């Protein structure tokens, strides 16, 4: 919708702010606001420049954020290499090759949850050894041979609708002391209904977990 | 060819 509304729709807009760790140096980041969480509209999903990881920050009500300012810059909504190769891999497990500075190539098994909002050329991906929300343009790792999609028992798109969604829930965990790992489920992956986006307090990372309460 | 250094924000914390 081109015409604006009194509420400021700050989703899909390049922003810029100062980050201050308590009694530390002030850093300057810019990035793209990807989404806003409906079960807590204070939270926005942000992708910083040069950073593959997606972060969840309560930008207006946070104290660590300084000089929040919206750039006149526009996100490059653009070309989709193939509408079919992307999503032929969504919901499938993959092995993503990453190489260290030494040159020693490694592999990380993970699953492609969805397609990124705002930057459509990017894919939502989470890894097993590191279960958080990352953003990579996989359409490139495949062409260069750094991404392998492997055969698995994944039927992809009661037969009738079930009330299954756990969005809006409240979670707590067995932290060894260290306060308590409290949080809230904020999203359900539309390709894998068992996989959920969780957002804990005292943390700005979007965790991608699989909730079934029993294997 | 991707790099884990890039992946997360270099300033940690």
Residue numbers in the entry:
A (entry chain A): 44 to 200, 205 to 262
B (entry chain B): 1 to 13
What does the published report state?
Spindlin1 is a member of Spin/Ssty family and was initially identified as an abundant maternal factor in mouse oocytes and embryos at early developmental stages. Structural studies have revealed that Spindlin1 consists of three Spin/Ssty motifs that adopt a Tudor-like β-barrel fold, of which the second Tudor recognizes H3K4me3 or H4K20me3 and the first Tudor module recognizes H3R8me2a, rendering Spindlin1 a multifunctional histone reader for H3K4me3, H4K20me3, and H3“K4me3-R8me2a”(25, 26, 28). Here we show that Spindlin1 also acts as a potent reader of histone H3 “K4me3-K9me3/2” bivalent methylation pattern. Structural studies revealed concurrent recognition of H3K4me3 and H3K9me3/2 by aromatic pockets 2 and 1 of Spindlin1, respectively.
Calorimetric titration revealed a binding affinity of 16 nm between Spindlin1 and H3 “K4me3-K9me3” peptide, which is one to three orders of magnitude stronger than most other histone readout events at peptide level. We were able to trace H3 residues Ala-1 to Gly-13 according to the electron density map. The H3 peptide lies in the negative charge surface of Spindlin1 with an induced short α-helix encompassing Lys-4 to Ala-7. In the complex structure, the two methylation marks, H3K4me3 and H3K9me3, are inserted into the aromatic pockets of the second and the first Tudor domains of Spindlin1, respectively. The aromatic cage in Tudor 2 is formed by Phe-141, Trp-151, Tyr-170, and Tyr-177, and the aromatic cage in Tudor 1 is composed of Trp-62, T rp-72, Tyr-91, Tyr-98, and Phe-251. The two methylation marks H3K4me3 and H3K9me3 are encapsulated by their respective aromatic pockets with buried surface areas of 214 Å2 and 236 Å2. Aside from the H3 peptide, the overall structure of the H3 “K4me3-K9me3” complex is essentially the same as that of the H3 “K4me3-R8me2a” complex with a superimposition root mean square deviation of 0.606 Å. The aromatic cage of Tudor 1 is reorganized to fit H3K9me3 insertion, which involves in flipping of Trp-72 and Phe-251 side chains. Compared with H3R8 insertion from the top, the side insertion of H3K9me3 allows a better encapsulation by the aromatic pocket, which is consistent with a larger buried surface area of 236 Å2 for K9me3 as compared with an area of 216 Å2 for R8me2a. Collectively, these data suggest that recognition of K4me3 by pocket 2 dominates binding, whereas K9me3 recognition by pocket 1 enhances binding and enables a more thermal stable complex formation.
